[PDB]
């Protein structure tokens, strides 16, 4: 049990809290980074406040801020709600709630993966069709079974190779 008190805050990976180029000159970054700064800045200002000299009202005042910040990245909202700046009085997302949102009670809130070889269209009664089968649009079969086709393309004179077969069908 000594570990329940935090003195070393783990930082989530970077590619998991991207910084990306959007459109025109707009940059989009993971909310988490605005909280991390908070922590970092407060933690630093703290150190500098200790070394500069220390009026203790001022050290606790910040030790508090610091604590609040340590909360923020972990879980926002269990106490007070962080907002970057006017535009979105929207709680900055936070680790805790990223994990939760994953599997928590909502209709499937954010539950479900998207498969790579899929497809959907309008259905229509296939009277002659047997139980056994189902009518599938060839045009669909094509990008559905694209890789499977590519090589049989190669197995027959239609195309010399794999990239050939690809541009042949682009």
């Amino acid at each position: 049990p000594e570990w329940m008190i935090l003195e070393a805050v783990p930082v989530l990976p970077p590619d998991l809290r991207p910084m990306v180029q959007v459109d025109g000159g707009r940059f989009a970054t993971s909310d988490l980074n605005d909280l991390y700064r908070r922590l970092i800045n407060r933690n630093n200002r703290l150190k500098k406040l200790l070394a500069q000299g220390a009026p203790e009202i001022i050290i606790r005042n910040e030790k508090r801020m610091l604590q609040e910040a340590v909360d923020a990245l972990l879980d926002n909202g269990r106490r007070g709600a962080p907002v970057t700046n006017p535009g979105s009085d929207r709680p900055l997302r936070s680790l805790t709630d990223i994990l939760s949102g994953k599997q928590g009670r909502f209709r499937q809130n954010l539950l479900g993966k998207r498969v790579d070889y899929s497809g959907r269209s309008v259905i229509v009664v296939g009277p002659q069709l047997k139980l056994h089968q189902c009518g599938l649009p060839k045009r669909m079969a094509l990008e559905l079974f694209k890789p499977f086709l590519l090589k049989k393309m190669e197995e027959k004179g239609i195309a010399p190779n794999v990239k050939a077969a690809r541009r042949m069908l682009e």
């Binding site: 009202i57 005042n61 508090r64 609040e68």
Partner: peptide, 12 residues
């Protein structure tokens, strides 16, 4: 409670 008032109370 609400972190502004108790600090204000504190140094004021």
């Amino acid at each position: 409670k609400i972190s502004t008032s108790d600090p204000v109370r504190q140094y004021l």
